[PDB]
């Protein structure tokens, strides 16, 4: 039952970090998708 707890910890770390990378992706998206279309 311990290995699934370790997997839960690693998956919550992955979620917490790839939240930041997806927000950085959104920032770069807006950096292209700015305004004067």
């Amino acid at each position: 039952i311990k290995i699934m707890k370790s997997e839960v910890l690693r998956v919550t770390h992955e979620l917490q970090a790839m939240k930041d990378k997806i927000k950085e992706n959104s920032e770069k998206i807006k950096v292209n998708k700015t305004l004067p279309y």
């Binding site: 807006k30 950096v31 292209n32 700015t34």
Partner: protein, 282 residues
């Protein structure tokens, strides 16, 4: 008041030029920008050892397009790596617009020169840099107080600064009025020359590799047919020459064809004999 000499040179290293060209092409049709690392050896020399690109921004090419944090971490990480060179200047690409400084370019250059008085603003044209010529100029600035009062922007002590002539496209956009073009020179030692020579250094093999024989006969037949036609043309021209006082020529094209036939046939024959000799069962 000290004045920058017209003999000042921007010594851009070879890999710096390669990186600038590659980044400028990569960003086409957008405009790119990166910071230049190097050292100001003296008043009359600016050495650009290396240049690093910067992330593309929605602003374009401005002083808000250079972000502080990426610049800081890049500088610190390169200093850790082994390139502890201060930022000398900035570069940006004008794709097909020629080499000059626009108003925003001048504003960014004023911002850069606030950091240090010596700071070049070299720009490059990625699409006009077709094989052969490379379109890249370097401008620093002209102080407004310097120009308004009457003095020349730069003192002259030699002919080094007058070897190259300014372009009309640069001149209209403010050259010799708000900025001066700094003579550009490429630092290329023997080692990098030899390394870059490997790009087209074919091999030790093709010097011995025979061309296809049937292809060789077909090529020889084609060139000898052209020889026959050109010889008819030359005979007709000579027959006119006697009925001609001194008053494309078939002879010249015949000379080029005979040259290509000679070199191809001699090369193939000599290579065949060499493979016969050295490439032997014994």
């Amino acid at each position: 008041a000290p004045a920058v000499d017209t003999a000042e040179q921007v010594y851009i290293s070879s890999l710096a030029l390669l990186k600038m060209l590659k980044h400028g092409r990569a960003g086409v049709p957008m405009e790119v920008m990166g910071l230049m690392l190097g050292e100001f050896v003296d008043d009359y020399t600016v050495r650009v050892i290396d240049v690093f690109a910067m992330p593309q921004s929605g602003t374009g090419v401005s002083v808000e397009a250079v972000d502080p944090v990426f610049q800081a971490k890049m500088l610190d990480m390169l200093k850790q790596t082994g390139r502890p060179e201060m930022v000398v200047g900035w570069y940006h690409s004008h794709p097909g617009f020629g080499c000059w400084l626009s108003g925003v370019d001048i504003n960014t250059q004023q911002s850069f020169e606030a950091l240090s008085e010596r700071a070049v603003a070299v720009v490059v044209d990625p699409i006009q840099s077709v094989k052969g010529k490379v379109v890249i100029d370097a401008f620093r600035l002209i102080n407004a107080n310097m120009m308004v009062l009457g003095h020349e922007p730069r003192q002259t002590t030699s002919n080094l600064g007058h070897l190259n002539k300014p372009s009309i496209q640069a001149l209209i956009h403010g050259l010799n009025r708000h900025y001066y073009s700094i003579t550009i020179n490429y630092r290329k030692n023997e080692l990098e020359q030899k390394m870059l020579l490997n790009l087209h250094k074919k091999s030790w093999m093709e010097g011995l590799t025979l061309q296809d024989y049937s292809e060789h006969c077909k090529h020889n037949e084609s060139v000898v047919k052209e020889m026959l036609e050109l010889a008819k043309n030359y005979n007709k021209a000579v027959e006119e020459e006697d009925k001609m006082t001194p008053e494309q020529d078939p002879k010249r094209h015949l000379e080029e064809h005979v040259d290509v036939l000679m070199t191809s046939n001699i090369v193939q024959c000599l290579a065949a004999m060499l493979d016969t000799v050295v490439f032997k069962l014994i």
